[PDB]
Design an enzyme around this catalytic site. Structure first.
Site, PDB file in Angstrom:
ATOM      1  N   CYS A 170      13.444  -3.453  30.984  1.00  0.00           N
ATOM      2  CA  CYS A 170      12.432  -3.810  30.100  1.00  0.00           C
ATOM      3  C   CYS A 170      11.895  -2.353  29.075  1.00  0.00           C
ATOM      4  O   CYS A 170      12.216  -2.844  28.267  1.00  0.00           O
ATOM      5  CB  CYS A 170      11.378  -5.004  30.899  1.00  0.00           C
ATOM      6  SG  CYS A 170      10.654  -5.680  29.801  1.00  0.00           S
ATOM      7  N   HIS A 203      12.474  -4.558  26.644  1.00  0.00           N
ATOM      8  CA  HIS A 203      12.291  -5.555  26.000  1.00  0.00           C
ATOM      9  C   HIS A 203      12.432  -5.809  24.266  1.00  0.00           C
ATOM     10  O   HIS A 203      11.985  -4.497  23.706  1.00  0.00           O
ATOM     11  CB  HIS A 203      11.109  -5.868  26.785  1.00  0.00           C
ATOM     12  CG  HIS A 203      10.399  -6.698  26.742  1.00  0.00           C
ATOM     13  ND1 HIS A 203       9.998  -7.275  25.525  1.00  0.00           N
ATOM     14  CD2 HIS A 203      10.978  -8.382  27.580  1.00  0.00           C
ATOM     15  CE1 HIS A 203       9.355  -8.777  25.964  1.00  0.00           C
ATOM     16  NE2 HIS A 203      10.217  -9.051  26.518  1.00  0.00           N
TER      17      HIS A 203
END
Length: 186
Positions: free
Chosen positions: A104, A124
């Site tokens: 992420c 992400h």
């Protein structure tokens, strides 16, 4: 048994921390949840409080590890990125040809510490611009991206895939299939 170091900083994303720790332990990996700021409990991004197994200072003494895992979280990744201790752990792991895995916002700590430049990586979507500042990587939209010993993933909803990719890298496809079977993944 294979061994994993999970570095837990204040503001870490608690799902991205707990899913890899749990799935790795299901696979028979010995996981050390290591607190960046020491052995005290860590307040995560949505205020879940996780008690580390050890301080990072103590866990580094018990290395090396077959994988170093970096969860995300906006503040967690920033704290990882600012740590001289994390830089040294990541540089040594890269030098001994050991796996590094980050999810992420976690991969932005690779950028901060100049780890794995030239790798294909994902993040992400919201962290893409930060990770690509300077053009030090090639970007991927894959839910999990493994380029040699640099393994990256995108978000809470890719955490099971990310964790099973670590298991496959360390313990093989069969162990990963065993661990996956009762998870009721989609």
């Amino acid at each position: 048994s294979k061994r994993a170091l999970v570095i837990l900083a204040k503001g870490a994303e608690e799902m991205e921390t707990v899913i890899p720790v749990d799935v790795m332990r299901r696979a028979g990996i010995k996981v050390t949840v290591a607190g960046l700021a020491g052995k005290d409990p860590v307040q995560c991004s949505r205020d879940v409080v996780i008690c580390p197994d050890a301080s990072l200072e103590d866990a580094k003494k018990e290395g090396p590890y077959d994988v170093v895992v970096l969860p995300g979280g906006n503040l967690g990744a920033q704290n990882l990125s600012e740590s001289a201790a994390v830089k040294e752990i990541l540089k040594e792991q890269e030098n001994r040809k050991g796996l590094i895995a980050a999810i992420c916002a976690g991969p932005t700590a690779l950028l901060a510490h100049e780890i794995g430049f030239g790798s294909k990586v994902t993040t992400h979507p919201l962290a893409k611009d930060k990770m690509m500042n300077g053009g030090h990587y090639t970007y991927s939209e894959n839910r999990v991206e493994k380029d040699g010993l640099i393994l990256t993933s995108r978000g809470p909803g890719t955490s099971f895939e990310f964790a099973l990719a670590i298991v496959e890298a360390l313990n093989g496809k069969e162990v990963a299939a065993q661990v996956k079977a009762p998870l009721v993944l989609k």
